[PDB]
Design a protein around this ligand. Structure first.
Ligand SMILES: [Ca+2]
Ligand SMILES: [Cl-]
Ligand SMILES: [Cl-]
Ligand SMILES: [Zn+2]
Length: 386
């Protein structure tokens, strides 16, 4: 039974784009349909955020904040000075300006979106001590995001999120493979990487770095520029936060709010070798992951980083063990779902045999009833006791 009226807000990972981008091919639904529309049509009011796919979780949280409540993105004077990018970004009207006036939301997040969502909650509730102190010392303005005492997120649900990072980042040649993964996602959308699109198609939203694809510039050529830019080479990046080391650093400060329900869903699409104890991609895994990513994920061990056999099961992009909630560098509690959802802890909703891209419908999987999955989740979220 419904116990709240909080709106659902969808949040993508290290790829992802707005509803009018990609010629309307949805990140949330892909070849399967339009998840936001399914939810809305079934009485679960649902919106979609679109933030910088390659940007740091911090940047993306600041962007999400302004997209939701309205205003001009403010990355924080101290943060901007530290990393050498613009303090201020784009300007929004604001999807839900009544979030400053008592509304609440459920965030459903895929992949790296789960990090971003946790970070938004932390900043909303606690602010940033560093930004507060910087603003004083330098007599400059402070975003309300960094004040603390804002509480508008009732729940965060994470789906295939690298809470403890993914070992994919440690691959030799991760740089080229990672942008080749982006190209494979474009291609799933029937977008070519060697075509000189004059329309925007897929805006990487890198205003703060001064980066933008030129009209007529192919994604091939653009991605070569990005590889060489600070959104690939700095520590203020998705790349850094995605790594086992970076995720652990994030976990050291981004904690579970006692006022928020956290739900985690994991994914795996592998079988174990009886002789090697390695894991191997199943029939039906999206081809790019199967060929380029999964073999590494299911075989890479690293005693120095605490990467052992428990890390090898994977969904083609992220180690499954990473997904049930933050553990490395974290004091968050994780509890197996027992039929009653709890505040302030990770409600571990278990592991689904679906790959990183299947679970959002970008890769097909006709035995996965993706509509039923999201509708059941929306029904659970609606049941949450304020
Ligand atoms: Ca498939
Ligand atoms: Cl690392
Ligand atoms: Cl399908
Ligand atoms: Zn930044």
């Amino acid at each position: 039974s419904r116990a709240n009226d909080a709106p659902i807000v969808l949040l993508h990972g290290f790829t992802g784009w707005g509803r009018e981008e990609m010629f309307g091919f949805k990140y949330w639904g892909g070849v399967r349909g339009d998840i936001e529309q399914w939810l809305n049509d079934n009485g679960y009011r649902t919106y979609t955020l679109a933030v910088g796919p390659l940007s740091s979780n911090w940047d993306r949280a600041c962007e999400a904040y302004a997209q939701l409540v309205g205003g001009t993105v403010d990355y924080g004077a101290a943060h901007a000075a530290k990393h050498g990018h613009a303090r201020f970004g784009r300007t929004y009207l604001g999807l839900l300006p009544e979030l400053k006036r008592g509304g609440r939301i459920h965030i459903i997040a895929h992949s790296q979106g789960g990090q971003t969502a946790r970070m938004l909650v932390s900043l909303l509730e606690n602010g940033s001590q560093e930004e507060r102190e910087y603003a004083k010392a330098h007599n400059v303005s402070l975003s309300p995001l960094f004040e603390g005492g804002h509480h508008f997120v009732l729940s965060v649900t994470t789906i295939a999120t690298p809470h403890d990072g993914t070992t994919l980042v440690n691959m030799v040649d991760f740089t080229d493979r990672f942008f080749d993964l982006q190209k494979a996602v474009l291609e799933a959308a029937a977008v070519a990487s060697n075509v000189p699109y004059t329309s925007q198609v897929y805006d990487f939203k890198l205003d703060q770095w001064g980066l933008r694809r030129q009209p007529g510039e192919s994604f091939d050529h653009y991605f070569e520029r990005l590889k060489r830019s600070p959104v690939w080479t700095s520590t203020d990046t998705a790349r850094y936060d995605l790594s086992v080391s970076g995720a652990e650093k994030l976990n050291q400060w981004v904690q579970a709010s006692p006022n928020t329900y956290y739900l985690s869903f994991a994914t795996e699409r592998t079988y174990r070798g009886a002789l090697t104890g390695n894991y191997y991609p199943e029939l039906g895994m999206n081809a790019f992951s199967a060929v380029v990513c999964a073999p590494f994920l299911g075989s890479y061990r690293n005693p120095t980083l605490g990467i052992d056999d428990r890390w090898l099961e994977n969904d083609g992009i992220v180690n499954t063990v990473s997904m049930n909630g933050p553990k490395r560098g974290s004091s968050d509690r994780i509890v197996p779902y027992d039929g009653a959802l709890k505040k302030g802890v990770w409600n571990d909703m278990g592991t689904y045999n679906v790959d990183h891209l299947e679970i959002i419908g970008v890769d097909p999987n006709p035995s996965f009833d993706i509509r039923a999955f999201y509708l059941r989740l929306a029904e659970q979220l609606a049941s949450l006791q304020p």
